[PDB]
Every structure is written in C-alpha cells, then in structure tokens.
Write a protein that binds this DNA or RNA. Structure first.
Ligand SMILES: [Mg+2]
Ligand SMILES: [Mg+2]
Ligand SMILES: [Mg+2]
Length: 802
RNA sequence: UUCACAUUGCCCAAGUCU
RNA sequence: CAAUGUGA
C-alpha cells in the first residue's frame, strides 16, 4: 500500500486555546514560472562555487539573456525564471570565466504552474505537486544561500557587534531554519531560530594559543611538545586556511628545520617572498595533497571564515553553548518575530521577481486542549489519580499490581570509604519504606551485600548470585558515577545470565530523597513484572473493545562523523489490554538506514508473545513509528507496512488485522506559542499539556496533527507531530488524537504525561540499551554485532530496558 | 547509573573541487 | 542514551 488516507474529519474534543505558530503566510501569484536545466563543466565543484558561476554568468550574459530577469538557482542543475528566457528546448552553451573557465548549458525543461499549486492547496487537485513546492523553495533560498552559510535547511552568519567565543578556536553562530510548506490555508514559510558552533576566522597563531591554552604565543619560545603538537594537529587537521587550502597535516620539524625537495621553509619565505618569520620555532601546516609537500608557516595563515565545527564540543563548550542559546517560550517567540521583521523577505529582489509576499506576523491557529485520562492505581484503595498540567503523583497510592520482593541482593562497586555500610543500610531502610508505601513490599534485608571493584568482578559475582540464591529477583548495583562497570552489568545481566538489575549512582545512595526513591521503585516494579498503574478502563477510546496491539518503533543512527557503526532498530509491542506491559525486539542493521530491515520477523515475535500473554489475536495493530521525515514517508511505508502484513500472513491463515501506521516526529521546526499571556504555563511559559492542532498549519489533504502531550519545564516545548500514513481502522480525528494522548500517560518511569506515546518512548530505550551492549564492539561482522544485542532467554519477555 | 523537559549528536536535508 | 542545563 502507498497513498496515505485523507483526513477523515476535524477533531472536536477539548476546550479551545488561541495559539501562534512560527509559520508565516505566503502570497504566491497564479502564474507559470519557467524551469531550466543547467549543466556545469567541470561538474565536481562545490554547490557554493556553482552558485557563483551562475551569478557571474547571469551578470555577464545579460544583454543576450537575463536582461531584466533575475533567475534563481539551486546550486546544482535547476534554474527558474519569472518570465521565459529566449530559448527552445534548444540548449545554449555558454562560457564563463570565474576570477577558471566553465562550460554552462541552459536547456528549457518545463513550466511550473503556481495555479496548480493553488488548486492542490484547495480541495480541487488530489495531490500536492512536489516540483512546484521545490521551485518555491529555490526562490526563497536563492539569496541567503550566497549571503549566508547554508547548513541543512538553515542559514548561519557571524553575529554583528557581538561575539560568543566557546574557546578552543570555536564560537557560536546564530541563524535560522527556513522551509516552504503547503497547508490547509496557504503556502507557509516556516522560520525558526537556531545556533551552532563555527571556527573563528582568526590567525592560525591565535588558533594555536586557544587550543594550547597560551595567553599569548611568546610562551614558550621553544618548539612544541609532541603532545602539544599532537593536540594542535588533531584540532586543525581538515580545516581550511587562507594566505584557500585544506590542512592535511602539521610538520614535526619547525619551519626553520623543515625542508622540502625543490630547502627550508623559513629560508624559502625569506628568499622568494621577502618575508622573515616572527616565529620560526613553530611547525608548518601541510596543506593540499597528503603525499605532496606544500607547507605553510603558521604565521601567514588564517582559518577561513564560515567553517562549521563538526566535532563534539567539550563539556565546557557545551555548557557555554547552552547558556548562550537557552530561551523561554516567550523569548523564543520574540526572537523569531524579531528575525522576521529584520529579514524583510519582501525586499529580497528574487522573492520580489517572483511576485511573492510573506506576512511578517506569525499565523494565528486555534488549538484544543484535550482532557487527560484518569490513572487507576491498586491496593485496597484503588486510588484514581487525575493529571493536572501534565503531571500527577503517587502519594497515598499503591501499584495496580505490585511485586513482593523476597530475595534481592546488593552489589556495591563504589569504594567502601565513600559509600559505607551505614550509607547502604540507611538507603536500604528508606527504600523499603517507600516501596511498602507503593505496594511493592521489600520484605527483608538483602540476601547478599558485598563490595566489588572493576568490570572483571561483575560476571563471577553475578554467576555466584544466580547459582546460590534460589528465587533471586533483583540485584541492586551501586555505582561510583560514570564507569565501564555499568555496561558490563547490563551485558551480564541482560544478555549473559538473564538477571534483573537496577543500578543506582552512589550519590543517590549517600543522600536520598522520597521522590528519587519513589521513581526508583517505578522502575523496579516494572522490571520485576509489575503493573504500576493503568488507564481508567472506562475512560479509554472504543478501539479497546476488541483486542488491539500497540507497537512502537524507532531506528537510532550513529553519531556525526561516524562511518562504520550499525544503525539500531527497535520495536516494542503491548502485551495486555491496559495497555501497560511491553516486550521488546531489537536488531543491528545497515549504517544509517532508516527502513527497519527485519521488521517482519520482529513483528511476528511480538504477535506471538501477545497471544501467549493475552490468549487473544489482535484485530488491530496500531504502529507508532518514530523519526521518519516527510521525504521518506513513501519509502518507509512501502517496506514497513508490507512487513507488518507479511508477519500476519506468515502466522496464519487469512489473519488480516487492520493496520494504522502513524509517524511520530518530535524533531521538526514547528513551534506553538500561547497568544494570551494568561495561558502560559510556568517559568518557561509554554502551551499546556494536551494542546492539539489539526487545522490551518497542517496538511491540506492528509491526516496529521500536532499534539503537545507534555508539560514544558524549560525552553520551548517541541509539540510532537503525528502523520497517519495508513489506516485500515478508519479512526476519527478525535479518537486517534485522544488515543495518542492517553498513550502518553502510560509510560512507567514517571507520573507525568511524556512527549511521545509510551510505545515509541520504549523503542528509544531499547535502541539505547542495545547501543550500550555494543560499546567498543561496533557477514561475520554482522553476526557478531547481532549476538551482542540479543538478550538472554529469560530477559526476552521482560521490560529490562526500563 | 531516579525521572522528565530542553540544547546538540540520528533518516531526509546539508556537506565533500611548497 | 552521552555531554550540558532546567526542574520534580
Ligand atoms: Mg530514530
Ligand atoms: Mg543524502
Ligand atoms: Mg542528562
């Protein structure tokens, strides 16, 4: 299956709230615009170089062509004009000299009708013509692509009149995201602010000082320590410098000592260029070809402007970045608004050429604030908790189903001197108190409590515990902060022996709080098979009247700059009618592949376990799929919808449950703000939990909505977006929106509505745990990685990822 | 490794020419 | 999840 279903209706549930979105309405003319194909030889040039080439070409060849007209260009092969050029489908070949000569061919390809775009935005046309949207994108990006430094769909520039140094030769550049989007109303310009790290365009000498912590360079006047030379080398290698060259290495010898087949560097610069070095003690930059011999003294070189820093920031740099860029929701809103008035898109000569107007104020949108579900607890009292502003508490409440803990052990890997037996005893007493209150009685002292040190001690201790203590339910593992012992505990517990473990940092043992201990109990109960709470059964949407399984799926990709690590696919599935308990599946797969390769096998496993747990076969499968961008919807849907079907088909016998396939995107560039100040919640001033938007700024024909399910603590809340790619079950907007919100209240690790539904959230936890199982380990290769993430038989059916 | 929220890191995007 | 903040 392929085509996403149309929006069935609009939601009606919940009180209204006035909102503003960072979407700016566009007025687009109803005219044909003209699309030309460009070919530039040689063709290996950076996109920015191509834009320059075309810019000169446009100025140079005006009299024959382009005379009044201002073309826009995508930096590759696509040029657009507001009026036609004098051409046929007949190519015209031009020569361009750039202060290098280029051969450029211009060939007519098509007319883009903006009239058709209007119709498609309206009801009239069934589909949105991508190519037309792409053309508008090229118009809006034309000038900023050359005026600023493009990064993704954003643009960055050095800030005028201020500096935000990060140290280490790095600094903060502020910028904005920009994208053109169709909507139920008009075309929209989506604008958000952002910031990212760039290298300071400074003398290399200054760069050296920042990297090596020299106040000034004169200290010392010796050549560098190899370690100093190595550290500097790590930082500058790959960066571009100008006198433009990319640095490929730093010499071991100083410019004075360093020679090449042609004498010394220093002497060459004395002789040929009549320059004498201030600092001939320092090494040279080797630039250009690694196997060649071009060397530049540090003193003659500048880091060239506008190079983004790709490397991870240090902890101090990160701290500085956070402080420089953190903003409340109202402050974020004002910054976007100020940016829009300053950007003045309507005096952009290219936007102007195409007769486009952009509104300078945020679009007004009405939201609805859904009512939260009630949360049912257990014990005698069977207390009901009522969320308010996205939060509830467990005070005077007991777990729906609490586990009695009879046999448990403590392993303390923190040093006895810092985490004493008194600490452990007091922590134990306080934990037992909180746990009894929660209906998860820890009915005695641990059966075993020992200090250990180092990763080598984990496996023999755990094997001893498993072999010795019949009925052992839990090992509480105390850690001295960040340590490789954690990953070893999870390797052994989750994958080697299949034993429940709960780690706790030493600092939270030495000094306990009731809220931390309570939260800890949330995880312990779940890990041991308990049910913390359930949605009030009678408050659930009607989908629950028949057996239904809820799946959450995510792929997590390796960090920036990584070239060989696998991506990790995780799928979880509900295992009861509440829905509360989940089981997990996980796979390693191709580097940076978003499509879940082995999804059919994963879903089959989950369906089998669902039937084993409930003795029902689902009549419906609700699949929440995290993190797929719009440009991947069709490709992902095609493989993954078919994989779900395949799993069903292979199980049985005309078993064809209805599938609802929903993409959840937490990371996108849509922000919503309270119009009225009295609606702003808390210090951060965000929209309230439950705020739902399915009008105005959403898709013109398809079934999508924003739901900000969580209370915003800090900064500006990201309202999660939900796009229904497939729906056999024919949900109404209301039912699916309410279902989705209720699922955000079923996440076991906290008494709060979280920002995405529990199944999607668990899928993330599963993928992250697999990554932990793979630390320093990432056909024969694939099998090794696959073995590493496979949990023990006894762990298979548990919520070990909690 | 108590937990959520937020920033970055993740598919698409972006980027790579003496 | 890691780094860094804001909170419970
Ligand atoms: Mg993902
Ligand atoms: Mg790409
Ligand atoms: Mg953190």
């Amino acid at each position: 299956a392929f085509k996403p279903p149309p929006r069935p209706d609009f939601g009606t549930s919940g009180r209204t709230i006035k909102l503003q979105a960072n979407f700016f309405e566009m007025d687009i003319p109803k005219i044909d615009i003209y699309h030309y194909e460009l070919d530039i030889k040689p063709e290996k040039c950076p996109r920015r170089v191509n834009r320059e080439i075309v810019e000169h070409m446009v100025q140079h060849f005006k009299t024959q062509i382009f005379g009044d007209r201002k073309p826009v260009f995508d930096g590759r092969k696509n040029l657009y004009t507001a009026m036609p050029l004098p051409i046929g489908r007949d190519k015209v070949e031009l020569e361009v000299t750039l202060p290098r000569i280029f051969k450029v061919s211009i060939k007519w390809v098509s007319c883009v009708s903006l009239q058709a775009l209007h119709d498609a935005l309206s009801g009239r046309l069934p589909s949105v013509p991508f190519e037309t949207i792409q053309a508008l994108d090229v118009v809006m990006r034309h000038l900023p692509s050359m005026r600023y430094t493009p990064v993704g769909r954003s643009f960055f520039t050095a800030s005028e009149g201020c500096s935000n140094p990060l140290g280490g030769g790095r600094e903060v550049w502020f910028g904005f995201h920009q994208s053109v989007r169709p909507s139920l109303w008009k075309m929209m310009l989506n604008i958000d602010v952002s910031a990212t790290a760039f290298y300071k365009a400074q003398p290399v000498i200054e760069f050296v000082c920042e990297v090596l912590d020299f106040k000034s360079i004169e200290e010392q006047q010796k050549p560098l320590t190899d370690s100093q030379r190595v550290k500097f080398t790590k930082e500058i290698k790959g960066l571009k410098v100008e006198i433009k060259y990319r640095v490929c290495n730093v010499t071991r010898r100083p410019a004075s000592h360093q020679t090449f087949p042609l004498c010394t560097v220093a002497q060459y610069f004395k002789d040929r260029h009549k320059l004498v070095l201030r600092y001939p003690h320092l090494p040279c930059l080797q630039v250009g070809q690694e196997q060649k011999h071009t060397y530049l003294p540090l003193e003659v070189c500048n880091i060239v402007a506008g190079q983004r820093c790709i490397k991870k920031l240090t902890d101090n740099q990160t701290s500085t970045m956070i402080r420089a860029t953190a903003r409340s929701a109202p402050d974020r809103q004002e910054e976007i608004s100020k940016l829009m008035r300053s950007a003045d898109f309507n005096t952009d000569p290219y936007v102007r050429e195409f007769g486009i107007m952009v509104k300078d104020e945020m679009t007004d949108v009405t939201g609805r604030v859904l009512q939260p579900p009630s949360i049912l607890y257990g014990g005698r009292n069977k207390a009901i908790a009522t969320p308010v502003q996205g939060v509830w508490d467990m005070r005077n409440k007991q777990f729906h189903t609490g586990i009695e803990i009879k046999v448990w052990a403590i392993a303390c890997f923190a040093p006895q001197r810092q985490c004493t037996e008194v600490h452990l005893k007091s922590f134990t007493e306080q934990l037992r108190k909180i746990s009894r209150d929660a209906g998860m009685p820890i009915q005695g002292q641990p059966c075993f409590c020992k200090y250990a040190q180092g990763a080598d001690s984990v496996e023999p201790m755990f094997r001893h515990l498993k072999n010795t203590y019949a009925g052992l339910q839990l090992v509480v593992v105390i850690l001295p902060g960040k340590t490789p012992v954690y990953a070893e505990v999870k390797r052994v517990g989750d994958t080697v022996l299949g034993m429940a473990t709960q780690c706790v940092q030493m600092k939270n043992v030495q000094r306990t709080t009731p809220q931390t201990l309570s939260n800890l109990c949330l995880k312990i109960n779940v890990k041991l098979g308990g049910v913390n709470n359930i949605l009030l059964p009678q408050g659930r949407p009607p989908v629950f009247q028949q057996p239904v399984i809820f799946l959450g799926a995510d792929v997590t990709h390796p960090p920036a700059g990584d070239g060989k690590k696998p991506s990790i696919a995780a799928v979880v599935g509900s295992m009861d009618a509440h829905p509360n308990r989940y089981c997990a599946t996980v796979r390693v797969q191709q580097h940076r592949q978003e499509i879940i390769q082995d999804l059919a096998a994963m879903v089959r496993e989950l369906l089998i376990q669902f039937y084993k747990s409930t003795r029902f076969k689902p009549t419906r499968i609700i699949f929440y799929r995290d993190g797929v961008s719009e440009g991947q919807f069709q490709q992902v849907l095609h493989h993954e919808l078919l994989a779900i079907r395949e799993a069903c088909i292979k199980l049985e016998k005309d078993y064809q449950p209805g599938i609802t396939f929903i993409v959840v995107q937490k990371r996108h560039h849509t922000r919503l703000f309270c119009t009225d100040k009295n609606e702003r919640v808390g210090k951060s001033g965000n929209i309230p939990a439950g705020t739902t938007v399915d009008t105005k700024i959403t898709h013109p024909t398809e079934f999508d909505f924003y739901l900000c399910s969580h209370a915003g603590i800090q900064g500006t809340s990201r309202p999660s977006h939900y796009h229904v790619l497939w729906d056999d079950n024919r949900f109404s907007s209301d039912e699916l929106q309410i279902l989705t919100y209720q699922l955000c209240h079923t996440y076991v690790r906290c008494t709060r509505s979280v920002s995405i539904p529990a199944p999607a959230y668990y899928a993330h936890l599963v993928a992250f745990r697999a990554r932990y199982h793979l630390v320093d380990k990432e056909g024969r290769d694939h099998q090794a990685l696959a073995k590493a993430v496979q949990v023990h038989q006894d762990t298979l059916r548990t919520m070990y990822f909690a």
